[PDB]
Design a protein around this motif. Structure first.
Motif, mmCIF file in Angstrom:
data_model
loop_
_atom_site.group_PDB
_atom_site.id
_atom_site.type_symbol
_atom_site.label_atom_id
_atom_site.label_comp_id
_atom_site.label_asym_id
_atom_site.label_seq_id
_atom_site.Cartn_x
_atom_site.Cartn_y
_atom_site.Cartn_z
ATOM 1 N N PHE A 30 -8.063 -5.544 -7.278
ATOM 2 C CA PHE A 30 -6.704 -5.073 -7.009
ATOM 3 C C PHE A 30 -6.220 -5.552 -5.649
ATOM 4 O O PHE A 30 -6.890 -5.336 -4.641
ATOM 5 C CB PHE A 30 -6.629 -3.545 -7.024
ATOM 6 N N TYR A 31 -5.067 -6.215 -5.623
ATOM 7 C CA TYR A 31 -4.483 -6.674 -4.371
ATOM 8 C C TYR A 31 -3.148 -5.965 -4.232
ATOM 9 O O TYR A 31 -2.101 -6.545 -4.509
ATOM 10 C CB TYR A 31 -4.256 -8.184 -4.374
ATOM 11 N N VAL A 32 -3.197 -4.700 -3.830
ATOM 12 C CA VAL A 32 -1.993 -3.889 -3.656
ATOM 13 C C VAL A 32 -1.260 -4.304 -2.387
ATOM 14 O O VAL A 32 -1.886 -4.567 -1.363
ATOM 15 C CB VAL A 32 -2.344 -2.398 -3.565
ATOM 16 N N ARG A 33 0.068 -4.352 -2.453
ATOM 17 C CA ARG A 33 0.860 -4.771 -1.307
ATOM 18 C C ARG A 33 2.129 -3.969 -1.092
ATOM 19 O O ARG A 33 3.057 -4.049 -1.893
ATOM 20 C CB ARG A 33 1.230 -6.240 -1.461
ATOM 21 N N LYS A 34 2.172 -3.199 -0.009
ATOM 22 C CA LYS A 34 3.363 -2.417 0.318
ATOM 23 C C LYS A 34 4.405 -3.378 0.898
ATOM 24 O O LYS A 34 5.577 -3.331 0.467
ATOM 25 C CB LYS A 34 3.047 -1.321 1.351
#
Length: 310
Positions: A306-310
């Motif tokens: 998972f590469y979550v990005r805000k």
């Protein structure tokens, strides 16, 4: 003999799509069909676990399949399980495949009840009684209510081991206290597996209840294998470009099989992949036993990244 299928008709399909039903069938429009083929089709269809009843017969040039799908479990509710939490029960069931969304095989109810009563042994409750109440719903859904009559708990009064020849029962037992049955069984298993008896096995355990059912006499029947040498650890599978490292965790000359050490290996690998963005890495090891050593085949599958990005 023969009978040319001009077409196929279905009755009773709902949760099962025509296309998949047909896929599982060994006949198709155009094929010539005889009693020998018909039994095979019925067998194939039943073999899917979708139906509770299958009926297949000729109707002119038509092959008619009449099916009664297994109900779908709309809900699963527990009543009376004062001592065991819902999740544990809902999970013991998931383990057995019974769960919401899936279908309910109504010829296995007794196994379901007995399985839960069996699960109750791990909590020291050897006299649990569990009845399952299946309630039909609107569609072809059903509700499954498992009523529990937990019994009184019991404590080990005496314990004997039969089959040991490498260690004295007095020796094996002295380690239990450091304490329920499931617990003792787990330490006794590690005990041998940690010492190389890669083929060690608890064949059966007899449990004699006390009249007031608050005590149990336990005699556990084992089979010590031989001591084995760990001849290697072949890691394989969906790695994520870290063989160089995991292999550093894999590999001794004449070291013997351990088991917990093996568990340590598995964990080391997950924790490694964890620090790499893989949170759900599946590591499973399997022994390739050779009577002369053991080769540990460890299959690893780094999950999704998972590469979550805000």
């Amino acid at each position: 003999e023969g009978f040319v299928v001009k077409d196929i008709h279905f009755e009773g399909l709902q949760r099962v799509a025509v296309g998949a039903a047909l896929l599982s069938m060994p006949v198709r429009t155009g094929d010539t069909v005889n009693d020998e083929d018909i039994s095979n089709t019925i067998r194939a269809l039943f073999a899917t676990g979708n139906f509770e009843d299958v009926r297949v017969l000729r109707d002119g040039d038509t092959l008619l399949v009449q099916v009664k799908e297994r109900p779908t479990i709309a809900s699963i509710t527990f009543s009376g399980n004062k001592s065991v939490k819902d999740d544990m029960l809902k999970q013991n069931l998931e383990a057995s495949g019974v769960r919401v969304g899936e279908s309910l095989d109504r010829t296995t109810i007794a196994d379901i009840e007995k399985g839960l009563e069996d699960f109750y042994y791990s909590v020291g409750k050897y006299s649990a009684s569990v009845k399952a109440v299946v309630t039909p719903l609107p569609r072809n859904r059903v509700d499954l209510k498992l009523v529990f009559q937990e019994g009184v708990s019991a404590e080990i009064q005496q314990i004997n081991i039969v089959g040991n020849h490498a260690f004295t029962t007095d020796e094996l037992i002295s380690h239990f206290q450091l304490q329920k049955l499931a617990g003792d069984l787990e330490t006794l298993r590690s005990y041998y597996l940690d010492r190389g008896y890669a083929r060690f096995n608890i064949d059966s355990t007899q449990v004699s209840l006390t009249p007031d059912k608050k005590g149990i006499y336990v005699t556990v029947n084992i089979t010590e294998g031989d001591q084995y040498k760990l001849s290697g650890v072949e890691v394989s599978g969906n790695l994520a470009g870290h063989s160089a490292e995991i292999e550093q965790l894999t590999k001794e000359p004449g070291e013997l099989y351990n088991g917990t050490k093996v568990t340590k290996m598995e964990d080391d690998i997950k924790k490694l992949l964890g620090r790499y963005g893989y949170a759900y890495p599946r590591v499973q090891s399997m022994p390739e036993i050779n009577d002369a050593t053991v080769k540990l085949r460890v299959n690893v599958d780094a999950g999704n990244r998972f590469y979550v990005r805000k």
